[PDB]
């Protein structure tokens, strides 16, 4: 199943981590490059935009 991870909204995370990331928006259905706080947020996270699409959509 893929829809699982592709359900939780992106987050910031006030942990020890500050880098660019990607997530799937259930509002539009496109991969938006957000900021990851490093610590495991919810579950909807991706290293690259492509994968995010080839994992949520394709």
Compose a concise summary of this entry.
The protein is α+β, with helices and mostly antiparallel strands.
Task: Spell out the helices and strands N to C.
Answer: EEEEH
Count of discrete domains: 1
Largest sheet: 2 strands, antiparallel
The residue fraction in helices comes out at 10-25%
Distance between the termini: 12 Å
**CATH-defined fold name:** Factor Xa Inhibitor
Please work out how many helical segments DSSP would assign.
Answer: 1
The CATH architecture: Irregular
Beta strand %: 5-15%
Radius of gyration, Cα only, in angstroms? Answer: 11 Å
Any idea what the CATH superfamily is called? Pancreatic trypsin inhibitor Kunitz domain
PDB class: toxin
Keywords: Kunitz, trpa1, toxin
Assembly: monomeric
Entry title: Serine protease inhibitor HCIQ2c1 from Heteractis crispa with TRPA1 mediated antinociceptive activity
Topology:
Blueprint (H helix, E strand, L loop, with lengths): L18 E2 L2 E2 L6 E2 L2 E2 L12 H8 L2
Describe this structure in words.
It is classed as toxin. Keywords: Kunitz, trpa1, toxin, inhibitor. It forms a monomeric assembly. The chain has 58 residues and is of the alpha+beta class. It has one domain (1-58): Pancreatic trypsin inhibitor Kunitz domain (Factor Xa Inhibitor, Irregular), CATH 4.10.410.10. The chain is 14% helix and 14% strand. It contains one helix and four strands. The strands form two sheets. The protein has a two-stranded antiparallel sheet. It has a two-stranded antiparallel sheet with strand order 2-3.
Which keywords apply here?
Factor Xa Inhibitor, two-stranded antiparallel ribbon, 1 helix, signal, toxin activity, 58 residues, secreted, ion channel impairing toxin, monomer, alpha+beta
